[PDB]
Nucleic acid binder design. Sequence first.
RNA 1: UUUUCU
RNA 2: GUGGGAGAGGGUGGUGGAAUUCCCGGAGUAGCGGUGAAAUGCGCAGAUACCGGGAGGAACGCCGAUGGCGAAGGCAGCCACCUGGUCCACCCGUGACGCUGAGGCGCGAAAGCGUGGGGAGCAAACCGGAUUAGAUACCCGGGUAGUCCACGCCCUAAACGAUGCGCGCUAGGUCUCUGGGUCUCCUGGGGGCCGAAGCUAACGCGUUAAGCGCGCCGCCUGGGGAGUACGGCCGCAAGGC
Lengths: 88, 73, 101, 119
Amino acid sequence: PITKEEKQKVIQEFARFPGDTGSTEVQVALLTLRINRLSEHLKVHKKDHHSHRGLLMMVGQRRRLLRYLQREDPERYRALIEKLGIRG
Amino acid sequence: PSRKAKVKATLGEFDLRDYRNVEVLKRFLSETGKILPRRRTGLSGKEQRILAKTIKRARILGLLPFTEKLVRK
Amino acid sequence: MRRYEVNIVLNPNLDQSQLALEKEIIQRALENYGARVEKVEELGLRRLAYPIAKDPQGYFLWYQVEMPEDRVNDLARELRIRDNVRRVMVVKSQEPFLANA
Amino acid sequence: KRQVASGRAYIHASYNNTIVTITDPDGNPITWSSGGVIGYKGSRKGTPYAAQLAALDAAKKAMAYGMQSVDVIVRGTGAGREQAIRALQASGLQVKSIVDDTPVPHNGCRPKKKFRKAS
RNA sequence: UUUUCU
RNA sequence: GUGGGAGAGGGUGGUGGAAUUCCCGGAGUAGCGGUGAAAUGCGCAGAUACCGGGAGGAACGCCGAUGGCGAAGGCAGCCACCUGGUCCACCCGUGACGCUGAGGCGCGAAAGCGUGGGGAGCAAACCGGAUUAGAUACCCGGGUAGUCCACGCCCUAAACGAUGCGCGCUAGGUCUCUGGGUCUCCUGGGGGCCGAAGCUAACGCGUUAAGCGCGCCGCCUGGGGAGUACGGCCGCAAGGC
Ligand SMILES: [Mg+2]
Ligand SMILES: [Mg+2]
Ligand SMILES: [Mg+2]
Ligand SMILES: [Mg+2]
Ligand SMILES: [Mg+2]
Ligand SMILES: [Mg+2]
Ligand SMILES: [Mg+2]
Ligand SMILES: [Mg+2]
Ligand SMILES: [Mg+2]
Ligand SMILES: [Mg+2]
Ligand SMILES: [Mg+2]
Ligand SMILES: [Mg+2]
Ligand SMILES: [Mg+2]
């Protein structure tokens, strides 16, 4: 599980400014996190199809956020990915 | 008419989550290791749902019977 | 980590030597698995609701530990090994749910 | 011959017969009877009367062994169940106690068609 | 038990 | 985002007791079983009924609901681990980032197929008994595939609410599951019932709409021929579209 610690570590880590809890960058960061824990959990458990739908929704939501991000500030975009690891 | 006295009233406060308080749990079983319905336990959807789980654990820890022979008859 | 409750029931026919012996293997067990004992209860011999291993009685324990979740399962894999240990139930600690209180 | 004095009276009632097995305080059968043991052969076997007779008989044979006291253990539902019981209560045996101990699965084996459909 | 057609 | 909550949602490992079957031991003896009646069948190599021990498979009684969870299929012994969804509170953060969705991709009850394993109970086919004018059936005795597990296929269904998804608007009453609050009431999420207006061929629906509206998808165009023929794509096959 993602502990409060690990989480808020990411939040600050990507936050646009002091107190930034839900910006495209933060959100995309948190999603990326979960997507990885989950994608991992499914390497083992090839048959947990129910959770897989979760993953599918998470990825989708991320795709949308980024799509919007790039649409708005294409720079913040290139930055986010690189920093994270997306597009890969 | 399931109107004698709900096992709840005939009992002080207690932690429904206690899987070892035999003396208390025992109260919720019948003349058999069967879990009394709510008309009997006098509990409630949420409570009863706990009681049950608790009772099962006690069962496994050889602390509560899964079943008993019926007398009288 | 997390707060667990380890219940153990063993042979009620153990002499103070045998009894103190298993409690030793248990202690090392807990230890070798990062289990830090917060407190302990030992009700001792109690009347089972039904025989367990032909025996009509049981000697109960109750070690409340704090250990790594990633090893609770493995911890019990070991505890059940003792021939006199005839019951091991590790439960997650939970706030008591009062009622009619 | 052994003289048992007190013992158990297992009644295997059912929608097809009913059979009684008197036993010693350890469960070892002394004597037994049934609808068939008595004259009865087929359908008649499961009747409550074929149970009364089987009970008294099983009881008589039990007296000859020295039996005087018994503990009844009813098992299964069936005509002749509560009859068998009354048959015993009478007889030369004293019925110390009565207990229903019919076996019931906590849902384990699939019943044959005859008994499927319920819950 | 079952127990067709008109 | 922070702080709470309920749940048979899912995956892995482990583990509990009841019951059936088989095996061993004891004690006991003439039947048991089965039906409308019976018979096949099982039993003196000792069955049935009773007690003790062992093995194995499969399913989890009460709790259990008129209950809950999930997108659907569907999900209930207990424990731990891994994991999806979701509701409430605070109003903290982003700032239209939204809805729908041809095709694609994934999931998808049962039966069925391939490889390996397993097999207690049940049981297509089948082998018998009976019933009948006949009985390729209904009832009874056996019984193989299968039902179980793993991996890979198949993709169908009364896959049903026979009701596509999202949003806004339109009396109330009553029961219930779960959360909050100043908690005999108020506020939110969910499951039911009666009903305003309104709708409906009628039955009925009615804030969980089948009412009033906007967006997008799918589909229908008399019955038989026929979900057939042909073609194509898919499948090991059955067969699917
Ligand atoms: Mg969760
Ligand atoms: Mg604000
Ligand atoms: Mg602003
Ligand atoms: Mg199947
Ligand atoms: Mg197969
Ligand atoms: Mg059969
Ligand atoms: Mg048959
Ligand atoms: Mg399928
Ligand atoms: Mg409501
Ligand atoms: Mg009207
Ligand atoms: Mg109505
Ligand atoms: Mg035409
Ligand atoms: Mg082909």
